[PDB]
């Protein structure tokens, strides 16, 4: 995301291809927001 | 870490020094981890 900027939808550009954009916020979240789900099972599951 | 950009390991630059890069997303998150761990302590309190 730090290398790319967006402008509008993706149908007007001629020759645009399909690929994902690696959002760097997600590894900082999926290693920590998913860690909350394990802490949710600390009291709910037993 | 938004003022700087990274490239590879630090074993190739001649004259590189040691310092700490202040990530700005962490202390907003880590203070929220303190509230979440307090909430998780509140989750496991009863």
């Amino acid at each position: 995301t730090d290398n790319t900027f967006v402008s509008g939808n993706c149908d007007v550009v001629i020759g645009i291809v399909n690929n994902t954009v690696y959002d760097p916020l997600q590894p900082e979240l999926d290693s920590f927001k998913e860690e909350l789900d394990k802490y949710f099972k600390n009291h709910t599951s037993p | 870490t938004d003022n700087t950009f990274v490239s590879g390991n630090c074993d190739v630059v001649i004259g590189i020094v040691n310092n700490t890069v202040y990530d700005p997303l962490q202390p907003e998150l880590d203070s929220f981890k303190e509230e979440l761990d307090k909430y998780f302590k509140n989750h496991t309190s009863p």
């Binding site: - | 490239s7 590879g8 190739v12 630059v13 001649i14």
Partner: protein, 50 residues
């Protein structure tokens, strides 16, 4: 920085060829050779008309 040993080695190799190529081609300094050739020869034909 990741290539300074290569860049510093390549620059000194390129600057070493300037010392050889300047004393190889004879007309390299032809830009300065004809500014003194034209002035001396026009001086020569000035006194040749006496």
């Amino acid at each position: 920085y990741e290539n300074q040993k290569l860049i510093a080695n390549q620059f000194n190799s390129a600057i070493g060829k300037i010392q050889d190529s300047l004393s190889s081609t004879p007309s390299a300094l032809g830009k300065l050779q004809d500014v003194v050739n034209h002035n001396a020869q026009a001086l020569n034909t000035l006194v040749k008309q006496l």
